[PDB]
Scaffold this active site. Structure first.
Site, PDB file in Angstrom:
ATOM      1  N   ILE A  21     -80.434 -24.406 -10.103  1.00 26.13           N
ATOM      2  CA  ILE A  21     -80.832 -23.292 -10.986  1.00 26.13           C
ATOM      3  C   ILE A  21     -81.634 -22.201 -10.111  1.00 26.13           C
ATOM      4  CG2 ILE A  21     -82.333 -22.561 -13.012  1.00 26.13           C
ATOM      5  CD1 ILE A  21     -82.119 -25.378 -13.969  1.00 26.13           C
ATOM      6  N   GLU A  23     -85.486 -21.225  -7.316  1.00 27.77           N
ATOM      7  CA  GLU A  23     -86.863 -21.943  -6.933  1.00 27.77           C
ATOM      8  C   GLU A  23     -87.845 -21.805  -7.709  1.00 27.77           C
ATOM      9  OE1 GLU A  23     -86.901 -23.779  -3.528  1.00 27.77           O
ATOM     10  OE2 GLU A  23     -84.320 -23.836  -4.018  1.00 27.77           O
ATOM     11  N   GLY A  24     -88.752 -22.696  -8.222  1.00 23.90           N
ATOM     12  CA  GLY A  24     -89.868 -22.635  -8.801  1.00 23.90           C
ATOM     13  C   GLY A  24     -91.138 -22.698  -7.947  1.00 23.90           C
ATOM     14  N   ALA A  25     -92.165 -22.564  -8.387  1.00 21.26           N
ATOM     15  CA  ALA A  25     -93.464 -22.549  -7.569  1.00 21.26           C
ATOM     16  C   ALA A  25     -93.710 -23.154  -6.424  1.00 21.26           C
ATOM     17  CB  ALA A  25     -94.973 -23.185  -8.595  1.00 21.26           C
ATOM     18  N   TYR A  26     -93.183 -24.710  -6.421  1.00 22.76           N
ATOM     19  CA  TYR A  26     -92.992 -25.343  -5.080  1.00 22.76           C
ATOM     20  C   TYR A  26     -91.913 -26.235  -4.829  1.00 22.76           C
ATOM     21  CZ  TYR A  26     -96.261 -28.004  -8.060  1.00 22.76           C
ATOM     22  OH  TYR A  26     -96.958 -28.884  -9.089  1.00 22.76           O
ATOM     23  N   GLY A  27     -90.802 -25.872  -5.109  1.00 25.09           N
ATOM     24  CA  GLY A  27     -89.686 -26.557  -4.747  1.00 25.09           C
ATOM     25  C   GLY A  27     -88.100 -26.086  -5.510  1.00 25.09           C
ATOM     26  N   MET A  28     -87.067 -26.830  -5.165  1.00 23.07           N
ATOM     27  CA  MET A  28     -85.677 -26.719  -6.096  1.00 23.07           C
ATOM     28  C   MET A  28     -85.933 -27.386  -7.087  1.00 23.07           C
ATOM     29  SD  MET A  28     -82.121 -27.907  -4.360  1.00 23.07           S
ATOM     30  CE  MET A  28     -82.150 -26.831  -3.338  1.00 23.07           C
ATOM     31  N   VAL A  29     -85.259 -26.432  -8.372  1.00 26.88           N
ATOM     32  CA  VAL A  29     -84.812 -26.975  -9.670  1.00 26.88           C
ATOM     33  C   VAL A  29     -83.282 -26.936  -9.894  1.00 26.88           C
ATOM     34  CG1 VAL A  29     -85.548 -26.534 -12.083  1.00 26.88           C
ATOM     35  CG2 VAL A  29     -87.166 -25.737 -10.313  1.00 26.88           C
ATOM     36  N   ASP A 139    -103.021 -19.675 -15.590  1.00 26.61           N
ATOM     37  CA  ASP A 139    -102.003 -18.987 -14.972  1.00 26.61           C
ATOM     38  C   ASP A 139    -100.958 -18.502 -16.067  1.00 26.61           C
ATOM     39  OD1 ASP A 139    -100.930 -17.789 -12.590  1.00 26.61           O
ATOM     40  OD2 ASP A 139     -99.663 -19.339 -11.776  1.00 26.61           O
TER      41      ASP A 139
HETATM   42  C1  LIG Z   1     -92.292 -24.066 -15.703  1.00 23.94           C
HETATM   43  C2  LIG Z   1     -91.852 -22.920 -14.691  1.00 23.94           C
HETATM   44  C3  LIG Z   1     -90.453 -23.330 -14.093  1.00 23.94           C
HETATM   45  O1  LIG Z   1     -90.143 -24.461 -13.993  1.00 23.94           O
HETATM   46  N1  LIG Z   1     -89.777 -22.427 -13.977  1.00 23.94           N
HETATM   47  C4  LIG Z   1     -88.397 -22.281 -13.201  1.00 23.94           C
HETATM   48  C5  LIG Z   1     -88.014 -21.327 -12.321  1.00 23.94           C
HETATM   49  C6  LIG Z   1     -86.780 -21.293 -11.575  1.00 23.94           C
HETATM   50  C7  LIG Z   1     -85.882 -22.206 -12.055  1.00 23.94           C
HETATM   51  C8  LIG Z   1     -86.217 -23.104 -12.907  1.00 23.94           C
HETATM   52  C9  LIG Z   1     -87.408 -23.240 -13.599  1.00 23.94           C
HETATM   53  N2  LIG Z   1     -87.496 -24.082 -14.633  1.00 23.94           N
HETATM   54  C10 LIG Z   1     -86.673 -24.453 -15.662  1.00 23.94           C
HETATM   55  N3  LIG Z   1     -85.633 -23.758 -15.983  1.00 23.94           N
HETATM   56  C11 LIG Z   1     -84.755 -23.931 -16.878  1.00 23.94           C
HETATM   57  N4  LIG Z   1     -83.833 -23.126 -17.400  1.00 23.94           N
HETATM   58  C12 LIG Z   1     -83.581 -21.764 -16.657  1.00 23.94           C
HETATM   59  C13 LIG Z   1     -82.121 -21.737 -16.479  1.00 23.94           C
HETATM   60  N5  LIG Z   1     -81.544 -20.541 -15.977  1.00 23.94           N
HETATM   61  C14 LIG Z   1     -82.332 -19.755 -15.226  1.00 23.94           C
HETATM   62  C15 LIG Z   1     -83.613 -19.980 -15.395  1.00 23.94           C
HETATM   63  O2  LIG Z   1     -84.607 -19.035 -14.427  1.00 23.94           O
HETATM   64  C16 LIG Z   1     -86.036 -19.524 -14.270  1.00 23.94           C
HETATM   65  C17 LIG Z   1     -84.413 -21.322 -15.980  1.00 23.94           C
HETATM   66  N6  LIG Z   1     -85.205 -24.905 -17.828  1.00 23.94           N
HETATM   67  C18 LIG Z   1     -86.323 -25.848 -17.758  1.00 23.94           C
HETATM   68  C19 LIG Z   1     -87.117 -25.376 -16.443  1.00 23.94           C
HETATM   69  C20 LIG Z   1     -88.321 -26.441 -16.350  1.00 23.94           C
HETATM   70  F1  LIG Z   1     -89.484 -25.972 -16.068  1.00 23.94           F
HETATM   71  F2  LIG Z   1     -88.310 -27.345 -17.572  1.00 23.94           F
HETATM   72  F3  LIG Z   1     -88.005 -27.202 -15.565  1.00 23.94           F
END
Ligand SMILES: *CCC(=O)Nc1ccccc1Nc1nc(Nc2cncc(OC)c2)ncc1C(F)(F)F
Length: 347
Positions: A21, A23-29, A139
């Site tokens: 997907i 990078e979030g606050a502190y790692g791979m998603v 935040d």
């Molecule tokens: C709560 C903040 C967070 O986890 N944001 C984030 C940032 C970058 C990548 C993924 C996440 N979390 C997340 N993303 C999705 N879906 C999604 C799909 N395509 C693009 C994005 O851009 C951010 C996000 N679903 C759930 C999450 C979760 F937070 F639940 F892990």
């Protein structure tokens, strides 16, 4: 174990078909197909055990998100880690997969007034539950608001959250602060530790302003520049609002500034609904004591189509753990993370 972008992402066998997907606050998603509840899910990899700060933040989010249960608050579905403390290097948190977040949406999409109204209602509905648990998010910003394909909104990332502590809120002028600069209430730079519920209302105010124009309302480039931006729009604080700032350094700094006029909301936001701007004014009030509370904001005429206090639940109990993990080292924190995640282990 599975690899993604030159990274161990060790989540299987339950979770397969991994797609990066971001990078979030502190790692791979990643997204992943959950072979049990046959849906794709979101999975974030947390590797915190080296730095105490990462450990404190990881534990806060886990304890809070497992205790909270609310439609407008992201849950934790599953937590993956090694069977023993010695083998545990990373923690994987499994959460509902969402289409986007408000930050990505605002950079690419015009919002109708109807979408603004529904987004704002859901932020406040989630926030009413958080504040009823005596918790401050601290935040709130567009990247911490997740959206699915039908525009249901969920608040995420409680890593910076604290138990409210209004009696210990006072500090000196220019006291350093962790939370995201553009959404920081003016009192943070003046005399506040951000230990009251009013800190979160300010951030929601900034998010509402940013939904109206697609641009942050107060884009400060540094700690004190943040205050320059706020005062450029609100204008100079009144004598009464200054009289509430007892600290001399903070008071005198404000007194040293040339007089600035209020910029009317309807000039800044010519296409906005007048009721949306009345609520914005009340959220973006300089004086935190006069700032609207979450429940009053829900009751505002702007949100009349949605307002239903019987369908705006509160928490069964206040959050007990006051924030007292501050003195705990990395090794006790690893132990506490291990304990808190035990329920997701087979039996
Ligand atoms: C709560 C903040 C967070 O986890 N944001 C984030 C940032 C970058 C990548 C993924 C996440 N979390 C997340 N993303 C999705 N879906 C999604 C799909 N395509 C693009 C994005 O851009 C951010 C996000 N679903 C759930 C999450 C979760 F937070 F639940 F892990």
């Amino acid at each position: 174990p599975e690899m993604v972008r030159g990274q161990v992402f060790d989540v299987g066998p339950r979770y397969t078909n991994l797609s990066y997907i971001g990078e979030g606050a502190y790692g791979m998603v990643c997204s992943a197909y959950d072979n049990v509840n046959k849906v794709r899910v979101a999975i974030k990899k947390i590797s915190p055990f080296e730095h105490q700060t990462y450990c404190q933040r990881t534990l806060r989010e886990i304890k809070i998100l497992l205790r909270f249960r609310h439609e407008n608050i992201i849950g934790i579905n599953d937590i993956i880690r090694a069977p023993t403390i010695e083998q545990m290097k990373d923690v994987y948190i499994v959460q509902d997969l969402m289409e986007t977040d408000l930050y990505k949406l605002l950079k690419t999409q015009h919002l109708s007034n109807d979408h603004i109204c529904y987004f704002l209602y859901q932020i406040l509905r989630g926030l009413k539950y958080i504040h009823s648990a005596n918790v401050l998010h601290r935040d709130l910003k567009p990247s911490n608001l997740l959206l699915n394909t039908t525009c249901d909104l969920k608040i995420c990332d409680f890593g910076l959250a604290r138990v409210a502590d209004p009696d210990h809120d006072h500090t000196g002028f220019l006291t350093e602060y962790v939370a995201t600069r553009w959404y920081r209430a003016p009192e943070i730079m003046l005399n506040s530790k951000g230990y009251t519920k009013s800190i979160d209302i300010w951030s929601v105010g900034c998010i509402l302003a940013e939904m109206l124009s697609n641009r942050p309302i107060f884009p400060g480039k540094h700690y004190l520049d943040q205050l320059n931006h706020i005062l450029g729009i609100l204008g100079s604080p009144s004598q009464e609002d200054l009289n509430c700032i007892i600290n001399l350094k903070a008071r005198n700094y404000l007194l040293s500034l040339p007089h600035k006029n209020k910029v009317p909301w309807n000039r800044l936001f010519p296409n906005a609904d007048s009721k949306a701007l009345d609520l914005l004014d009340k959220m973006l009030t300089f004086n935190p004591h006069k700032r609207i509370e979450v429940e009053q904001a829900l009751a505002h005429p702007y949100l009349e189509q949605y307002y239903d206090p019987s369908d705006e639940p509160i928490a069964e109990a206040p959050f007990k753990f006051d924030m007292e993990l501050d003195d705990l080292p990395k090794e006790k924190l690893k132990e506490l993370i291990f304990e808190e995640t035990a329920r997701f282990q087979p039996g």
